[PDB]
Amino acid sequence: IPIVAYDIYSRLLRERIVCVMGPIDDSVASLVIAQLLFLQSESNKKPIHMYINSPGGVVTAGLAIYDTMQYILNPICTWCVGQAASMGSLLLAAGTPGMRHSLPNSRIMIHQPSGGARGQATDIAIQAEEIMKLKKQLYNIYAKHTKQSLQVIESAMERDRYMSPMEAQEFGILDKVLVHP
Amino acid sequence: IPIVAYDIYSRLLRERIVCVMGPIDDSVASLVIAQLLFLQSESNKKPIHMYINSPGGVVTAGLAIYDTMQYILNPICTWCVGQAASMGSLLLAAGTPGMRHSLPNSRIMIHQPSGGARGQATDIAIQAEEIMKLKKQLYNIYAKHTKQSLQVIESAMERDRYMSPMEAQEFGILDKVLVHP
Amino acid sequence: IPIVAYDIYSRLLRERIVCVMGPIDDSVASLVIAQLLFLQSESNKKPIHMYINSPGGVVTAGLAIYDTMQYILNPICTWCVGQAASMGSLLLAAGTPGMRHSLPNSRIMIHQPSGGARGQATDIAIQAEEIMKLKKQLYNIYAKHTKQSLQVIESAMERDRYMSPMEAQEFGILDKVLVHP
Amino acid sequence: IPIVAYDIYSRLLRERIVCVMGPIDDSVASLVIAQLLFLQSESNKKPIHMYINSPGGVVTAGLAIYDTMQYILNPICTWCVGQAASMGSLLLAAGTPGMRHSLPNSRIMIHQPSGGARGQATDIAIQAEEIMKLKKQLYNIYAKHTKQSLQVIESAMERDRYMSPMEAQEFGILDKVLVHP
Amino acid sequence: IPIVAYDIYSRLLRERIVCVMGPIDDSVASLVIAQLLFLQSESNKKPIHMYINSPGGVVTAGLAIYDTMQYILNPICTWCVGQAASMGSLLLAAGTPGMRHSLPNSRIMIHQPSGGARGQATDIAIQAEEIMKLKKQLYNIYAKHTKQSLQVIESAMERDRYMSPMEAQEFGILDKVLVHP
Amino acid sequence: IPIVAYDIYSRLLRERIVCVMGPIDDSVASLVIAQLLFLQSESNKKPIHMYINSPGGVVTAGLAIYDTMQYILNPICTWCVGQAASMGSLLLAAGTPGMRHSLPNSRIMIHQPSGGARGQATDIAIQAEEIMKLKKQLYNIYAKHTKQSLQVIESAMERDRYMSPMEAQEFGILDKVLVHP
Amino acid sequence: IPIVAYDIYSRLLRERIVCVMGPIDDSVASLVIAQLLFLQSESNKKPIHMYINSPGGVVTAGLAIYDTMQYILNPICTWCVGQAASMGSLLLAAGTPGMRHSLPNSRIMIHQPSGGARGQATDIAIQAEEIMKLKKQLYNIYAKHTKQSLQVIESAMERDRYMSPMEAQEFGILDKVLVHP
Amino acid sequence: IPIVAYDIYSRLLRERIVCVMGPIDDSVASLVIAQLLFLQSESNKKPIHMYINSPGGVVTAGLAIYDTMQYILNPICTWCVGQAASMGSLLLAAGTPGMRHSLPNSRIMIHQPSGGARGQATDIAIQAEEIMKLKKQLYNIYAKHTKQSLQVIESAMERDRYMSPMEAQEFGILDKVLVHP
Amino acid sequence: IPIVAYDIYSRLLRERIVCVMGPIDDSVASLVIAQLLFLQSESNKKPIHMYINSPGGVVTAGLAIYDTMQYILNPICTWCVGQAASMGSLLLAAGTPGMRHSLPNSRIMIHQPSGGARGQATDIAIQAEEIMKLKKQLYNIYAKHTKQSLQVIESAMERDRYMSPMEAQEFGILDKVLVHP
Numbered sequence A, B, C, D, E, F, G, H, I: 001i002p003i004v005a006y007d008i009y010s011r012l013l014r015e016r017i018v019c020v021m022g023p024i025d026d027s028v029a030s031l032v033i034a035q036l037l038f039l040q041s042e043s044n045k046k047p048i049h050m051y052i053n054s055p056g057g058v059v060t061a062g063l064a065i066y067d068t069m070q071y072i073l074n075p076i077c078t079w080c081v082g083q084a085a086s087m088g089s090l091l092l093a094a095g096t097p098g099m100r101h102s103l104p105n106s107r108i109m110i111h112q113p114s115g116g117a118r119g120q121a122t123d124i125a126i127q128a129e130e131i132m133k134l135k136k137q138l139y140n141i142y143a144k145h146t147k148q149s150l151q152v153i154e155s156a157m158e159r160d161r162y163m164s165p166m167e168a169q170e171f172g173i174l175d176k177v178l179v180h181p
């Protein structure tokens, strides 16, 4: 990591740029929330830019970031660079309307959640009930921000669904596919 | 394994004695069914003795043995030696009425089934539905042979429930606790 | 393995009983085919009994057994004991019409094939084309023996589909659910 | 970890924000207590904000934090971000009354403690007695802060019990579910 | 294993000699019970000789053997060769009165049972209750055959208690310490 | 492996049936050659039946079998059961003209050889020259028995090429696709 | 570890607070002694606060800390936070009389030392003699600071003995159980 | 890493030199994009120099860098040092026309993408469709910057194709092969 | 690493001394090139000293360094300390004529390149062609700087060829063997 607020990510932080890179877990989520709360405290008016290059991650860690993005007053511009899959595509869609961007060659992928269950039949019934609830929760989120109906969402996310940026724009995950500024 | 129809288990087979020992898996189940079908073909009238010392095992392997025991015409005497837990307690209860035996110091344990699930939320919902069906199936079997109501069965099997032979007799899992012949 | 044509499976072979137990691989398939060809050479008229307790296995190994069952002149009675999943459910359905049996508590499961692919994009395109062809092949087989239409087959096998013996009979996988002979 | 009191968590510390993130162990507990004692020494009047995103952890480490929260004079606002399970849900409930918050999409889970025992029968009897005492201890804590009766607590925590924020508010684990400030 | 009913242990079986050697598990217990039932069927009058050299083993496997020894009509002579610890000392004490032997340099050891427990606090409470019951069970057995009071048994077995053959005879575990026949 | 010249493969050997099953290595090749030489010595006139279910194997081991098949005077009938890939498809094609068979659902696959090289640049140049020679060798063999030109062979084997039995017959790998005898 | 004498533990050191956290080994002991000697050199009059959250540790490492606590002139206040087991409970008891504190929900555990021995019988006799001496040493220490007789100490520490803070106060391990300052 | 903006890579950053070294993954891509955005913000007019020594890497990580290079207004000079294979050769070709350089002894390699697929046949069909789309995408990129037709691109990239710098210049991957400045 | 531009290698960098130590890989090559470009930018006239102690390394990483040495305008003095084998001997020979040095007891070794190949026969033919080209490339480099004919080079490098400094000077790898300055 190179040095220029000294190391390169801190130097970008002064620009109000937050990088969401790689798998999203609790540690990653913790960091991003900290930066979003810091950037809100520096000012509640200036936009924040979130650059997303992620294969996905943990649902509750992603929902933590998503709630933080909704809760802070700042407008948030989201940028898909390279890929946005699972949680990364959800966070991309959660950007302020008219402020959700992709580069020309990024890939978007959406799908239903996956997990596991163990134990006695009663413990398994509880855990299956919980992942079903989370599935419905996530589908509501995607319906809200993309404006697609629940039926469309359910049909699209049953299996892995890869999108080009133009397809994603048509779907409602993002607003602009920009080549040059 | 010692030699006396030559090795000691084959020598017992001539007595119409089948040994169900240790964990019950497909291989074990395969063997026991083979011996039961052989002993039926040698005669459909003479009783068979099943000696059970088992910690439990795979549900479908156990249900395979259980169905074989019901299907053949021979009366089957069951003997609890040492322990009968999970499937072993179910097979013990499945013996011909009035022919289900324990030695004085054997332990019986009954409980609900356990397992796992993996994959997408839809795959998990299917697998949880399947272990729930198996649970209801097994509870019906225990209710049939012990004469307890379903409510009693459900209450008893929610957690691990260890029994002395006298308790098991009271429950209806077995008929006789014998010290000497 | 006990001794009574001496060991218990050889002793059953004299009864024209073939055991298909556990995962189906090339070795298992090799054995079963050998026994079927032997039993045909001993006589082409007498029925053969195939007892199936299997979680599934390799497609080509299973198709090897399936072709052997069709090719020999003998009628083949199939028996589901414990479970028939994947290839095991297909082999169960491949028994001579009116001769396909389940015990009361067996579970049947049907689903589409699964696999993997690796290499260059051209190698992956070839391997995906091959598993697609195998899927269509298998669906034709199930349609033939169950008399369901292809559409029904495709709908049923998209995900894991567990069946009781009565459901399986309704589906057309088997003819008789027998409690006692 | 980015740099802006220089690194991002230290920069939040100046805001009197303590982050309780991931599994709670002795090291984590040590850190949180240190920060709480530091923030009390900086002033005993100003509130402290505890942001909780935790799957749970060690009972004594969690009880250490819980006692520290009760002992210091400062009011403590608790924030559920993402999830609060086991100890995390207990620490969330331990916040100053009227000051316990969740974001809209957080999950709360409550359950009884789990552990192990080994050794001679006398050693096992001691260890089982100890985890039983800890269970009663924890149930008293939850009853105190949620105002539910012990009977309700015992019924709810026998198995894993997941809650939405509104359900948690109804239960008494938290006071406010906030979308925007 | 050398050959002389051909291999050396089978050749001893014709003498009505059963060898209980090494750790006692289900497999070992299965074998010994099979031999005891065979030797009873050959005649119910002739004594059986059990030669014991064991460090101990599984409680239910040992109790299986112990019940078999009580159930068969034959008198059983027990021989301590080398050591009898845990279950081995219990099986030695279970021989027919006046027929329990040690060689001059054998060691006897008695102690309480050991085990483990895991899971939720409710599961641990059940498992601890079960090992306590087994402890009381075993102490009753030792009191019966040695004629010591329960209080003496409890005091002696709290910790590992090694005995010479003469001490064991004084205790009541055995009757004769023989140098030459 | 079951017993009926006693075990099932030996019992088939008396029928002049050789089984080529699974991966082809030196050991497998050794066995098959031994059986072919034995069956020739029993008579040079009677046909031999080779049943092939193989994923492939070592080139020199396969070429060993192939040369043996050409060298012995007996006509050889080849049977594809399940699959014939790599060497297995070559051995299938090497059967006596008009005597090469597939079952209806077998898969045939043909491809070029694969391997590795290591060492100094001079050692690598030698090893690459050797696998190139082997490639040309094998393509000549396939051209001979299928009657396709070298150009066709080279085009077909550049990548993995799966065939149905009818396609294989069209290609010239086999003569008859038989459903029933 | 966060930064505010800069990192949080150094910042507490300026308050004369020493943290004894987790397992006590030579490294941990080295650190604590260094801090105690530093804090004595800064002044011999001002009290030191030792916060203890420990599962236990090495006897000689703990005795090193204990001797340092006795040797320095400063009064030492000890605080049980979360747990004090083994050496942690001993160090808690070693605080200046009237200055030994617990929070309400801490657990105290006392027990005898444990270890191992290896080698020749002479080497084992030496090592057993050494752990016996250490046991007597430790029991004298506990008797001194708790004012219990040796007999009481020996009885209490034979097995693991868990205490609530009030029980510990009654025992004499600590003076005050404080809820709020 | 040596120190002279202090460490050697930061010291080069002040020269507007970005190093793309070794395998290209998300972390590497993240860093390079950060530096490119920083260098654009320092001025949009001054050229950037990208030094490439890479064996290749992840497609989406590489496409992320490639899109960033196109999006920023600065001209970008690319330098092949040592090797440019896979993504490294693509990034080399993506430099500003007339500004793409190689040293005399660098090797360029181009080839099609590689990957894997797993799961059900439907999941495999989706994943194969996705790598096919990515292949077409990449071939369009190479056609754009090298000015070769798609047919030429497809023919060249079917297998690994190594190039000297002069060959690469002829192909259109680069403009200048420089010995001295 | 000790501190005196602060750590010892940075302190030498101010002397225009670059250390090439141990195996040469991409990371090592990256560092050396960075330092050479930095030292050129500080001035294009002042010589650079390269101290070489290397067992060898990756060809393209070494060729990267070699091209950098040729490209920069500065004269480069090379010093063999301890050993120069493979790439290390090539880099030693690449120093400015009259400026290539060895200490008295250094060992030089030259040999041909080594590697590996895998895959289909076509992939292996490509990879063997590539290592052959690299071999010819390297032999041209050695011929250029040592002034030996290609025939001499080929003969010398077929096997490992160790040289004393005087032998190396005779060969033309270096100019001066210095005892004292």
Ligand SMILES: *[B]([O])([O])[C]([C][C]([C])[C])[N]C(=O)[C]([C]C1=[C][C]=[C][C]=[C]1)[N]C(=O)C1=[C]N=[C][C]=N1
Pocket (backbone or CB within 6 Å): A055, A056, A057, A058, A059, A060, A085, A086, A087, A088, A090, A111, A112, A113, A114, A115, A116, A131, A134, A138
């Ligand atoms: B995605 O592919 O990243 C996807 C999120 C999408 C639905 C918005 N991720 C998941 O579904 C994860 C997968 C995972 C499981 C286990 C560890 C790490 C990642 N599922 C969960 O996180 C999860 C959480 N609670 C219950 C079940 N599954």
Ligand SMILES: *[B]([O])([O])[C]([C][C]([C])[C])[N]C(=O)[C]([C]C1=[C][C]=[C][C]=[C]1)[N]C(=O)C1=[C]N=[C][C]=N1
Pocket (backbone or CB within 6 Å): B055, B056, B057, B058, B059, B060, B085, B086, B087, B088, B090, B111, B112, B113, B114, B115, B116, B131, B134, B138
């Ligand atoms: B018992 O304790 O043996 C119990 C049977 C009882 C309910 C009559 N066994 C099980 O429940 C087993 C546990 C197991 C799981 C996995 C491997 C081996 C054993 N459960 C199952 O076999 C099972 C089968 N299908 C679905 C889910 N679980």
Ligand SMILES: *[B]([O])([O])[C]([C][C]([C])[C])[N]C(=O)[C]([C]C1=[C][C]=[C][C]=[C]1)[N]C(=O)C1=[C]N=[C][C]=N1
Pocket (backbone or CB within 6 Å): C055, C056, C057, C058, C059, C060, C085, C086, C087, C088, C090, C111, C112, C113, C114, C115, C116, C131, C134, C138
């Ligand atoms: B079943 O669940 O057993 C199922 C067969 C069903 C469709 C009649 N099995 C498979 O689909 C197997 C799974 C498997 C993969 C790899 C090793 C072992 C088992 N699939 C294949 O065998 C296969 C074969 N060729 C290509 C792809 N997949």
Ligand SMILES: *[B]([O])([O])[C]([C][C]([C])[C])[N]C(=O)[C]([C]C1=[C][C]=[C][C]=[C]1)[N]C(=O)C1=[C]N=[C][C]=N1
Pocket (backbone or CB within 6 Å): D055, D056, D057, D058, D059, D060, D085, D086, D087, D088, D090, D111, D112, D113, D114, D115, D116, D131, D134, D138
């Ligand atoms: B929770 O799920 O985090 C839960 C706490 C809840 C009851 C408030 N955690 C536990 O119960 C832990 C689980 C655990 C065991 C072992 C290592 C780490 C975590 N139990 C204990 O910590 C514990 C402590 N002492 C005795 C027994 N169990």
Ligand SMILES: *[B]([O])([O])[C]([C][C]([C])[C])[N]C(=O)[C]([C]C1=[C][C]=[C][C]=[C]1)[N]C(=O)C1=[C]N=[C][C]=N1
Pocket (backbone or CB within 6 Å): E055, E056, E057, E058, E059, E060, E085, E086, E087, E088, E090, E111, E112, E113, E114, E115, E116, E131, E134, E138
């Ligand atoms: B002895 O030392 O062999 C002793 C038996 C004695 C009391 C007559 N053995 C045990 O107590 C065994 C130890 C053991 C545990 C686990 C695996 C193997 C051996 N205890 C048990 O077998 C047991 C059984 N059920 C519950 C708890 N412990």
Ligand SMILES: *[B]([O])([O])[C]([C][C]([C])[C])[N]C(=O)[C]([C]C1=[C][C]=[C][C]=[C]1)[N]C(=O)C1=[C]N=[C][C]=N1
Pocket (backbone or CB within 6 Å): F055, F056, F057, F058, F059, F060, F085, F086, F087, F088, F090, F111, F112, F113, F114, F115, F116, F131, F134, F138
């Ligand atoms: B096939 O897929 O089985 C194929 C044979 C076909 C061309 C008739 N097999 C091979 O090409 C084998 C693959 C292999 C390599 C290493 C171990 C085992 C199998 N190739 C060789 O055996 C081989 C032999 N000598 C040199 C190079 N490769």
Ligand SMILES: *[B]([O])([O])[C]([C][C]([C])[C])[N]C(=O)[C]([C]C1=[C][C]=[C][C]=[C]1)[N]C(=O)C1=[C]N=[C][C]=N1
Pocket (backbone or CB within 6 Å): G055, G056, G057, G058, G059, G060, G085, G086, G087, G088, G090, G111, G112, G113, G114, G115, G116, G131, G134, G138
């Ligand atoms: B306690 O549980 O931490 C306890 C101390 C108590 C008696 C005040 N600890 C010990 O007894 C330790 C256990 C241990 C053994 C080996 C490594 C680490 C910890 N015993 C000893 O340290 C020890 C030292 N010398 C001889 C024997 N045992």
Ligand SMILES: *[B]([O])([O])[C]([C][C]([C])[C])[N]C(=O)[C]([C]C1=[C][C]=[C][C]=[C]1)[N]C(=O)C1=[C]N=[C][C]=N1
Pocket (backbone or CB within 6 Å): H055, H056, H057, H058, H059, H060, H085, H086, H087, H088, H090, H111, H112, H113, H114, H115, H116, H131, H134, H138
């Ligand atoms: B090259 O050799 O680096 C090449 C890129 C070229 C086509 C411009 N790389 C790939 O094709 C990579 C290989 C790889 C696979 C898995 C992990 C790391 C690298 N392929 C992919 O990244 C990929 C991505 N999505 C789907 C399939 N393959």
Ligand SMILES: *[B]([O])([O])[C]([C][C]([C])[C])[N]C(=O)[C]([C]C1=[C][C]=[C][C]=[C]1)[N]C(=O)C1=[C]N=[C][C]=N1
Pocket (backbone or CB within 6 Å): I055, I056, I057, I058, I059, I060, I085, I086, I087, I088, I090, I111, I112, I113, I114, I115, I116, I131, I134, I138
């Ligand atoms: B030397 O011994 O360091 C020698 C270089 C000499 C010819 C100037 N090294 C090599 O030949 C290396 C060996 C190596 C292989 C694999 C990893 C690391 C080192 N060969 C190569 O680097 C290479 C590169 N491309 C193709 C084949 N071999």
